[model samples]
Target: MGPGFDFAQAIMKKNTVIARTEKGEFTMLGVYDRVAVIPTHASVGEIIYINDVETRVLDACALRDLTDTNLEITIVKLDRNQKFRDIRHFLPRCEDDYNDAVLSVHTSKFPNMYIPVGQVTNYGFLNLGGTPTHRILMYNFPTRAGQCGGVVTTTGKVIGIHVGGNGAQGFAAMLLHSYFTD
Candidate 1:
């Protein structure tokens, strides 16, 4: 089959899982062992269900210059009961390499839906809810509302999580290892 079709099947079906907050939904980025990174844009302190399993906010990653509102990743500490057989071993550290094919699987504007494919466009300033814009990666796809925290990957390597972006042009980028590292 083709590439996009495989992204839908492998990345969408096997890897991407949804997290349901009370008012919104996003993707559960399971790269760490017993840890899934989420977007701080969601209601972090409030109740959240990861792939239908209950969990709370473990921690939130914030940079010095960026405001808390601009913080992109909220760490979700998974329990032994929460299983993820599809955890990724290799993930991309940053968004370089122009025109590289990428894919994202998120909850869509609605729930239970996902968009499959896009391309690496550029890295520029992305608002991402901060008063001061932060520069991050951009992919050539429209990750609509409620689809934040989706996983972005190229050829089985993570480019980061989907943060949201301009319509049909590109979307905001994802987390850095420092966000998860202590």
Candidate 2:
């Protein structure tokens, strides 16, 4: 079977459905150089372009799919490329209020590029009262729905998923770093 084979069972779950359930196939480069199809994910949002020119995040995980955990969809925005020195601090939250911020996110109508690693379904939290440990998956990174797929490790590990964060916490993404980081 190629990548994304039997994707229905391997990549999808509650609230998260394949954008193109039929006639769709996933082909990813496995950690060992083998070709495979992995599930990718992205959240609903409008990409806000700050800095006036494209507003491309250097490498802070912006356009990638991520695993589902924590009973919530955790999407992150990262610097995919190693070009900038301070990309981590550009976490969208500080740039949301800018009216000139150009948004360039993808909707369900557009093609998806992220691959799903796993799903988060109530990751040890009760909402009523708890310490609220700041948990995140380090392997996964941020990704855009139509722009790019979620970031994956060469060893077949996901770093994070891309979730829009302009409206929620004034951030640009939902970082998933606590899952793998030690």
Candidate 3:
């Protein structure tokens, strides 16, 4: 019911998408669930599909504690005919100084959509699936546990990638700016 909430709802309607490896099965916590666009870069690797269009992973890197965890991000190139409406704009800072309200589009439910307000609890090392690493801690994200890969946005810009979480709290790859820069 707030500005951030409305912003997420509007962006998600057209921006949220599903991604998967060439032969991987699509599931809530499996190869493909939900993803958003970062239209600035491109790379090649295992086959991936977004928005029903086949894509290829071009590059991947840890968006967090690169030394200790596997919270990696993969840059993909979409088929020539497939393109997103508006690639999300990213926040300028990666630290905890911003009180930006975040939200995610839960595509696990598919056609029946869900967008929940996600409050950033903090930013630091969290034991995600047993691996301790730096990530954005979010709470009040009402959805399934292990809800991997989705678009997490604040205002009109993207701040993180929803990796996985319990119903109340979740982990997102922060510092998205680094992924966009050289």
Candidate 4:
């Protein structure tokens, strides 16, 4: 399921920062808010500049979850913590199967977001287990590391995030939300 008419508002950006850890460097990504989602593989950095603002990994993806996905985008929170959940920002910046959450329909069965540049060339289950999770969707046109984590949008809304380029796979914004239990 992809976008048809919808795909505007709530552009999440600017906050995404490139972080460095003892192991290696990772691109800080997903939801540039107080609570952001990065790879469970890594996120909060030993040292980052702006988004750096001292971050920490709140949650992570398990090895089992990686069987289907190359890696789970871990949920990281801005160390500056407080209480900032203002769900009323419009005007965008975005991209996900790294797009399981968006594209879902309230009635019948289908996706609502539209694929851009990449014409969703395929589809399949996001993952198995957990009593059967929702199915996943995918597009063609493999991406590179630099462009990875790049997002796709419709109207102005982000529907997916490019997590990897090996397969050029991305997850829907909803899937990113799936990690945000908070």
Task: Judging by TM-score against the true structure, name the best candidate.
Answer: 1
**Model 1: which ten-residue window has the lowest total lDDT?**
60-69
Which runs of model 2 end up more than 4 angstroms from their true locations? 1-108, 112-133, 137-155, 166-182
Candidate 3 clashing pairs? 43-58, 44-58
Q: Model 1 segments beyond 4 Å from truth?
A: 4-8, 60-71, 83-88, 106-117, 133-135, 177-182
TM-score of each: 0.72, 0.21, 0.67, 0.49
Q: Candidate 3 residues 1-182, lDDT tens each?
A: 67877776765665555554433312211111123332111222455665466665544333335474554344443443444553434444555533556545444344424465545666666666676656555656565632455556667566665656766666665635544443
Model 1 per-residue lDDT tens digits across residues 1-182:
45644553565565556787775777776755566766656656545676677765554443323443354556666543554553444554553643345545556455445455555655655665554445456765655666677666655556666666667755545555445453
Candidate 3 TM-score over all chains jointly: 0.67
Ranking by TM-score: 1, 3, 4, 2
lDDT of 4 by residue, 1-182 (tens): 33432332133323344544553344444453465444343433444333334455543343224445443444555555453343223213222322222221111121122234545423434552232222233655554334333444444344444443335554332233344444
Q: State in Å the error of residue 57, model 1.
A: 3.9
Q: Give the per-residue lDDT digits (tens) of candidate 2, residues 72-181.
A: 23222322222222222222221111111111212244423333333322122222112122222221224322322222221212222222221211112233333222
lDDT winner among the candidates? Answer: 1
